[PDB]
Structures are given as structure tokens and as C-alpha cells.
């Protein structure tokens, strides 16, 4: 797999550094000279180029990349023109970072395979942690079911798993308990719940909220 990342910002530069860490061939393209010099050591190849130009895009050998990530999310004109060129060049996978709702609609029309909202998705996840401080990290399996990594309270100290009627009353299944950097995978009844550490739970979205308030 050969990856090309166009636009070395906070979001684009993180993809370059992570893919280079995993041992992947990454082409880092940016119009800024200082950005390319900073990410020259964090990419297989770093080029100072304008992606809105077809002649400069063909000089990179961009047709040899299966995945191209257009991480420009503040210039709609630069973002939409780039993916119009890549779609014309028959790139199998174009992932674009969008800015707002209207930018999302343009990229969907001109054939962007996946459209990403990094700050919008994180802001929704952060606002869930602000509203309820008991949660630490959650993953939405669907619109009604989710896996929530809860934080243990003071009332849950010295409590066994069989004491908590999550399976019967709340209809939720405890998945894993982490104690002081040691994680217990699929605990069996019964285990004593320690102080304020991680507690992974799975259930309906409304059912987990009932467990937090009651227990």
C-alpha cells in the first residue's frame, strides 16, 4: 500500500507520522516550504507542490497511489479542486477532510469516497464527556447501543460483580475492568470493584444512563 497525504496540517501531519511509524510508503505534499521541511523526516517522500495544478500532480506520480488523503479543511477551493483532479485521474480511494456541511455536500457530488470531520467528531465525543463525567471513552456500535468505558465511583468500591444486577435489571453486560494499569479481560463473577479506575460496559444507550444515575 502506497499512501499520499496532501496538506500537512495538524490532521494531515498526524496521518503522515502514524503511517510512517507503521512502516508504510507515504508521500507528503504541501504548498508550504516550512511544512515540507518539518515532515521530510516523517515521510518517505516530501514534495513542495500545489495540488490544484494537474501538471504538478502528474509530476509526483500520483497515479501510483491507491490511497490519497486530501487533508485541506480550511480552503474549500483548494480541497474541491484537488479531489476533482484525483477523480479525473482515477484514484481508487480519495479521503477528504471537510470543513462544514456545505463543503461535505460538494465533495459528495464530485466523488469523494470518504469524507472526514475531525474536529466535529471529536467535539461531539468531548461534549459527551463534559455532560457526564463518569464516562471516559465510548464507541457507538449503532444509534441505540454503545460500549462505554465508565469511571468507578466511591459507591462502587468493595462491590462484587454479582452484587451489581446489570445483567438482569439494567440489561447491560460488563466487558472488562482495568485496575491500576492491569486490565482484566472478560471478568467472571465475582470480582471486587476497586477505586476510581476504568470499567468497560456494554448495553443500550438509555440503559447505561440508568446505571450511572442509580449506581
Amino acid at each position: 500500500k502506497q499512501f499520499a497525504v496532501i496538506g500537512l496540517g495538524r490532521f494531515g501531519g498526524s496521518i503522515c507520522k502514524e503511517l510512517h511509524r507503521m512502516g508504510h510508503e507515504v508521500l507528503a505534499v504541501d504548498i508550504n516550504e516550512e511544512k515540507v521541511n518539518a515532515y521530510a523526516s516523517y515521510a518517505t517522500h516530501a514534495v513542495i507542490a500545489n495540488a490544484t495544478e494537474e501538471n504538478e500532480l502528474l509530476s509526483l506520480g500520483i497515479r501510483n497511489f491507491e490511497y490519497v488523503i486530501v487533508a485541506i479543511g480550511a480552503n474549500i477551493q483548494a480541497s474541491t479542486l484537488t479531489t476533482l483532479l484525483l477523480k479525473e485521474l482515477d484514484i481508487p480511494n480519495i479521503w477528504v477532510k471537510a470543513q462544514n456541511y456545505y463543503h461535505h455536500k460538494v465533495l459528495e457530488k464530485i466523488g469523494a469516497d470518504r469524507i472526514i470531520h475531525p474536529e466535529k467528531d471529536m467535539g461531539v465525543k468531548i461534549a459527551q464527556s463534559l455532560s457526564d463525567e463518569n464516562v471516559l471513552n465510548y464507541i457507538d456500535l449503532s444509534d441505540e447501543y454503545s460500549i462505554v468505558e465508565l469511571l468507578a465511583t466511591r459507591k462502587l468500591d468493595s462491590k462484587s460483580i454479582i452484587d451489581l444486577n446489570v445483567r438482569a435489571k439494567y440489561g447491560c453486560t460488563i466487558l472488562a475492568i482495568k485496575h491500576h494499569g492491569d486490565i482484566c479481560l472478560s471478568p467472571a463473577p465475582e470480582d471486587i470493584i476497586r477505586e476510581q479506575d476504568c470499567l468497560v460496559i456494554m448495553g443500550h444507550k438509555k440503559d447505561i444512563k440508568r446505571f450511572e444515575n442509580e449506581g
Binding site: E33, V36, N37, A46, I48, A49, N50, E56
Partner: protein
């Protein structure tokens, strides 16, 4: 493609000239296919290297073909191409004007067609006058049939920086003659100073109004000939072979003549094979440098040598820019001079490397022959008649690239691909 037209057109004149010299009418003796090709190439590249004697091997018709190749090669292929189109009445287009810009090494197409009119009219005028001045001396010695032709042949040969001579001794019988020395040295100095330099002096009669290029050529040539005249006179004063059995007046003429002839005429008044090794070393640097960007000379030009030399001295003195005559010199001028000098040394190195494999000759003669062939000077130490069939073919390639220039030869077969992309800076220690 403008460099491709120059390379194709200049090569076709070698083939056409080789056929004409190989006809039984043009020669008195049978001539080899390589010697006919070498003589034709040595004329259109205007070098003057002769395997066979020009006076004896060729007839009067054969020497007329030599004058045609010298005149066509000396002024350039595209110089006469514009004249033919102008005579026929066809107007010069933009495409035809870009060829003249490449042939004359001009940066802009502004007033380049009118320059060809000036340089062609000046060439025929000064060769006709110099033939008349030489007629007062060559006619009482060779009659009217040969005296007039000898003056006409040598005026064209000297002005175009050829060095061809009808006599078996290339101007070795006129060491102390002021008539032959002053007229011939006036021809290749003015003929090699540059067509743009001559046009500037004609229209501007004051030195402060000259351009930077004109002031560099006038001052650079005067200083370079002064150093060369002192070097030849001091080194060869006690030499018994040359400059030893001569009067003080004759020593000054021969020292002055040998100071100016390596750039790039290739005439002589003393035997270069009997000179000391010290003078030959200084002559190689002398004939590695030519004269004038748009002239009848070759090699790296005098302005290329001055630009590189001043750029280094400015770096050694800590200066941030190259300044000659209170004028800054931009980066594109520096890199073009850098490309000319490096490519020329690479071709000369390959020529010396190829000649040592093929020819069994002393090393000093091989180096002297390659610098003379590449600069299209034509001075010999006694190697050109001794070259083998494979050795002559190497010199023909060297003379061809030397006359057309290393840059225009490479641009013929080097396709240019434009890429606007850039790369992050890399640090490499070049100490």
C-alpha cells in the same frame, strides 16, 4: 528544436563539403574518405587542423570549396540562412527569428535580424579591404594569378579564425614582416572580439556608453594579450629552437604573434613542437579560453572565464555578489558560465582519455591536440599527420562539439521536462 536545427544544419555542411573535396576535380592526389571528412570538418568548424597540405593536395577549385566552408562555418549556419530568405523576398517569421537568437547566443530577440545585416556587411567589407592590403605584398612574390588568390584566401581564413595556409610553412616565412603580422593579427582579433562588441563600437564612440559585455571584451582582451606576450617572450628568449636566432625586433613580432594566435586563429610564426614545456602549459590555458560569445572563435569565452574568476574571488573576499565594472551579475549568468566550463572540461577529458587509448604519442602532444581541437585553434606539435583512422574520428567529434558549443550540443538530445514541484532542503558538506 532551435538547438536541433543548428546541430542538423551544421552537420549537413560537413557531408556536403566532404563530397565536394572528394571529387577528382578538387584535388591533385587521391584522398582518403576520412581525410576528406577531416578536412571538411576542420573547415566548417573553422579549426585549421590539416592532415594533408592545403596547397598541394587541393586544386584552385578545391581551395575555393575551403573558402566557402570557412565563410559559412565562420559566420554560422543561420547567418547565411537569413540572407537567402531576405534575398528571395520572404519575410522573417517569429519561428525563424528564434533560430537566430539561439545561433547568436542572444538573450532576447530584440533587434537580432538587424544584427545579422550588420555583421555580414562588416565581414565582406573588412575581408575585401584586408585582401587589398595583403595584395601589395603577396602579388610581387607570387605574381597576379596566385598573389591575388593567396591574399583572398588568407583574409577570409584570418578573419574567421581558421589558420589555414596555402604555403607549406604556416606563416613561418613572415616572422619579421610587419605587413603580414599587423594585418592578420588585426583580422582575428577584430573577427573574434564578438559581433555584438563590434556593433556597439560602431554605434557608440565613447567608452562610458559601452555595455558591460563590450567593456569586458575590450579590457579583457587587452590584459590577456599583454600577459601572454610577456610570458612567451620571457620563457622562449633563451630557447635555441624558437626565438633564439632572431633579432630583437623579430623577437617582439613573434612574441606578439604567438600571444594572440591561440585565441583562436591557430596561425604561427614559430614551431610549437620545439617550444619549452612551460610555454605549452600556458598556451593550453590560453586556447581553452576563446574570445567573444557571438564571434568566429570557440572554446569557453573570455566573458565566461572572467565571470567565473570574479565569482570565486568575490566568494573568497566574503562579498555576497559578483560585481564587475560596478555592475552586479545575476545568478542565471553565473550558472550558465558554470555549465559551459564544466561541460567543456568533461569533453576535453574524454578526448584526452580516448586519444591515449588509441594513439601512441607523447602525452604533451595529446593534450595539446585535444585543447586545440576543442577550442578550434588548430595549433599542432606534430600529431595531426600521425593520427590513425580511429584517432581522426575522435578529433572530428571534438571539433564538432567545440564549434557548436557544449551547451547547444547537449540541448539537441536532452528533452526538457518542466516540473514546478520543489523539494525540502538537504545539507551536504562540500568542503
Amino acid at each position: 528544436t532551435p538547438p536541433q536545427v543548428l546541430a542538423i544544419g551544421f552537420f549537413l555542411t560537413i557531408i556536403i563539403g566532404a563530397v565536394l573535396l572528394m571529387l577528382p576535380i578538387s584535388t591533385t592526389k587521391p584522398l582518403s574518405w576520412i581525410d576528406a571528412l577531416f578536412t571538411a570538418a576542420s573547415a566548417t568548424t573553422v579549426t585549421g587542423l590539416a592532415v594533408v597540405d592545403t596547397g598541394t593536395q587541393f586544386t584552385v577549385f578545391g581551395q575555393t570549396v575551403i573558402m566557402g566552408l570557412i565563410q559559412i562555418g565562420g559566420l554560422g549556419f543561420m547567418t547565411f540562412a537569413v540572407l537567402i530568405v531576405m534575398i528571395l523576398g520572404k519575410k522573417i517569421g517569429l519561428k525563424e527569428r528564434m533560430l537566430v537568437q539561439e545561433a547568436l547566443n542572444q538573450p532576447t530577440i530584440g533587434g537580432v535580424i538587424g544584427l545579422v545585416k550588420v555583421l555580414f556587411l562588416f565581414s565582406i567589407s573588412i575581408e575585401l579591404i584586408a585582401a587589398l592590403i595583403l595584395s601589395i605584398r603577396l602579388v610581387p612574390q607570387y605574381g597576379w594569378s596566385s598573389g591575388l588568390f593567396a591574399s583572398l584566401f588568407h583574409a577570409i581564413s584570418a578573419f574567421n579564425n581558421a589558420g589555414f595556409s596555402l604555403w607549406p610553412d604556416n606563416l613561418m616565412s613572415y616572422v619579421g614582416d610587419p605587413t603580414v603580422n599587423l594585418v592578420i593579427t588585426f583580422l582575428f582579433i577584430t573577427g573574434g572580439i564578438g559581433f555584438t562588441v563590434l556593433f556597439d563600437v560602431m554605434k557608440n564612440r565613447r567608452f562610458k556608453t559601452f555595455s558591460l559585455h563590450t567593456k569586458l571584451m575590450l579590457t579583457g582582451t587587452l590584459m590577456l594579450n599583454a600577459i601572454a606576450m610577456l610570458t612567451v617572450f620571457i620563457l622562449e628568449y633563451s630557447n635555441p629552437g624558437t626565438l633564439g636566432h632572431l633579432h630583437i625586433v623579430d623577437k617582439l613580432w613573434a612574441s606578439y604573434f604567438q600571444a594572440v594566435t591561440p585565441r583562436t586563429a591557430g596561425f604561427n610564426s614559430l614551431d610549437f613542437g620545439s617550444m619549452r614545456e612551460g610555454t605549452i602549459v600556458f598556451t593550453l590555458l590560453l586556447m581553452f579560453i576563446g574570445a567573444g560569445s557571438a564571434s568566429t572563435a570557440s572554446g569557453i569565452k573570455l566573458t565566461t572565464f572572467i565571470v567565473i574568476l570574479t565569482s570565486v574571488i568575490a566568494y573568497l573576499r566574503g562579498k555576497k555578489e559578483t560585481v564587475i565594472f560596478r555592475r552586479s551579475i545575476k545568478y542565471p549568468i553565473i550558472i550558465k558560465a558554470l555549465a559551459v566550463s564544466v561541460t567543456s572540461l568533461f569533453i576535453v577529458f574524454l578526448g584526452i582519455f580516448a586519444l591515449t587509448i588509441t594513439e601512441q604519442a607523447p602525452f604533451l602532444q595529446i593534450v595539446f591536440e585535444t585543447f586545440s581541437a576543442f577550442g578550434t585553434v588548430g595549433l599542432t606539435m606534430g600529431l595531426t599527420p600521425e593520427l590513425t583512422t580511429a584517432g581522426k574520428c575522435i578529433i572530428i567529434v571534438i571539433m564538432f562539439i567545440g564549434r557548436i558549443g557544449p551547451l547547444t550540443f547537449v540541448f539537441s538530445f536532452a528533452k526538457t521536462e518542466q516540473s514546478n514541484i520543489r523539494y525540502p532542503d538537504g545539507e551536504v558538506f562540500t568542503g
